[PDB]
Homo-oligomer: A and B are copies of this chain.
């Protein structure tokens, strides 16, 4: 007795669902993969020459498969009805009111997907929740399925967290450090788990596939994300200590990271981490711990967010202090709005928070990013936006007549700008605030040109 997945439906065509299913289709030519979404313009973009997200290599993966065994559709109902495997990869926004307001994930879209699946399903199907931050997701799906049975309907629920990082999604999906699958410790659960393993074994060695139960799967993802965020907050805390004592956080990070028990990754100090994963993940971990009467664990992990918030505030107040605490009507260029390089995603970007701190001081911001759409920047910063915010088409326009240049995202193009040209047209003193350490090694040239260079973790 086993189950072979021949048709996959993925509900959610976002940063998780789109790339993941495109790689599955690419690696499994005999499996039909249909990605569905309520958002019609997003589906139309997936079917166009201009994809709705920017991921290096994604266009090539999509175009090698689309229309052969990879499909993007708004017909959610028919995709479910015919699927052997249904992924749920939707967003779980933070509650904006009620218990856990601003902290706890809202499961309403997961629950609506589960209800929609029952409505449109007959026979046997595997339903797998796949997200970067699963918060009681498998349990809520099972609760709906347990309460809404039909004769001969047999739905299995798996957890399959997604470990990809945006901007490296395709490389991460093709060579994952591990694949994590959680399922019930019953004959039915193990048959479903094996079926999903067989999909991944088309390109992932078996020794890199971990199998467990659904809760251990979700807790492992929640903890792993928090460990990553903690490394960043830890090295950022050291960056403040370096600034206060004359050390350089990049040199300290190198010495730390050469301990093979620590490792040398995720030790790059920055204005602060962003993205839809880390802050949401730690907030939900803290909230969960409070609900379980584990306040010591809750306040332990809360420090990861408190440190990130302090790192952002400290960076902004250095900018304001350098401008002698009045920035009313001063032009300031913001270079980089995405939460990291090589994506157009801005969710929880530090650039949003730095911009708002400067807007509260009356700065006239000119914002340039090579990939973030103009309209997204307007939405993220929302009358005050109308008065203070300009979206520049190129970085020289943003810097023309500026008092300060603030680098918030580590796009490689920023280290190659014509900084002699930028200096000529800035007001003096002309400041560069490197919130990403991308201008390291240009410091002598920039000082010779005449800039005041300030960067995180060095004074």
| Residue ranges of A at the interface with B (Cβ–Cβ < 8 Å) | 95, 98-100, 104, 106-108, 111, 136, 140, 143, 163, 177-178, 180, 208, 210, 212, 215-217, 219-220, 223-224, 226-228, 230-231, 233-234, 237-238, 240-242, 244-248, 251-252, 254-256, 258-263, 265-266, 288-289, 292-294, 296-297, 299-301, 303, 306-307, 310, 317, 320, 324-329
A237 to B288, CA, bound (A): 13
Set of chain B residues within 8 Å of A252, measured between Cβ atoms: 216, 219-220, 223
Set of chain B residues within 8 Å of A106, measured between Cβ atoms: 326, 328
Please state if A258 and B215 are interface contacts (CB–CB under 8 Å).
no
One of B212, B254, B294 near A241 (C-beta < 8 A): B294
Please state if A261 and B251 are interface contacts (CB–CB under 8 Å).
no
Please state if A320 and B212 are interface contacts (CB–CB under 8 Å).
no
Known interface pairs A215-B245, A324-B111; A255-B224 also in contact (CB < 8 Å):
yes
Instruction: Give A143's nearest chain B residue, CB to CB.
Output: B324
Set of chain B residues within 8 Å of A210, measured between Cβ atoms: 254-255, 258
Set of chain B residues within 8 Å of A299, measured between Cβ atoms: 303, 306
Please state if A223 and B256 are interface contacts (CB–CB under 8 Å).
yes
CB distance from A227 to the nearest CB of B (A): 5
Known interface pairs A100-B325, A320-B99; A260-B265 also in contact (CB < 8 Å):
yes
Set of chain B residues within 8 Å of A140, measured between Cβ atoms: 324
A224 to B238, CA, bound (A): 10
Please state if A242 and B219 are interface contacts (CB–CB under 8 Å).
yes
A241 to B217, CA, bound (A): 14
Set of chain B residues within 8 Å of A220, measured between Cβ atoms: 251-252, 255-256
Known interface pairs A216-B251, A230-B234, A300-B306; A259-B163 also in contact (CB < 8 Å):
yes
Set of chain B residues within 8 Å of A136, measured between Cβ atoms: 324
A223 to B246, CA, bound (A): 15
Please state if A297 and B180 are interface contacts (CB–CB under 8 Å).
no
Set of chain B residues within 8 Å of A256, measured between Cβ atoms: 220, 223-224, 227
Set of chain B residues within 8 Å of A143, measured between Cβ atoms: 324
Instruction: Give A242's nearest chain B residue, CB to CB.
Output: B219
Instruction: Give A219's nearest chain B residue, CB to CB.
Output: B247
Set of chain B residues within 8 Å of A254, measured between Cβ atoms: 210
Please state if A251 and B303 are interface contacts (CB–CB under 8 Å).
no
The 26 listed contacts between A and B (C-beta, < 8 Å) are A98-B325, A99-B320, A104-B325, A107-B325, A108-B328, A108-B329, A136-B324, A143-B324, A178-B258, A178-B259, A180-B255, A216-B247, A219-B238, A219-B245, A219-B247, A223-B238, A223-B256, A224-B262, A234-B300, A241-B292, A261-B263, A261-B265, A262-B265, A296-B307, A296-B310, A300-B303
Known interface pairs A230-B234, A293-B293, A294-B241; A326-B107 also in contact (CB < 8 Å):
yes
Please state if A266 and B255 are interface contacts (CB–CB under 8 Å).
no
A256 to B178, CA, bound (A): 10
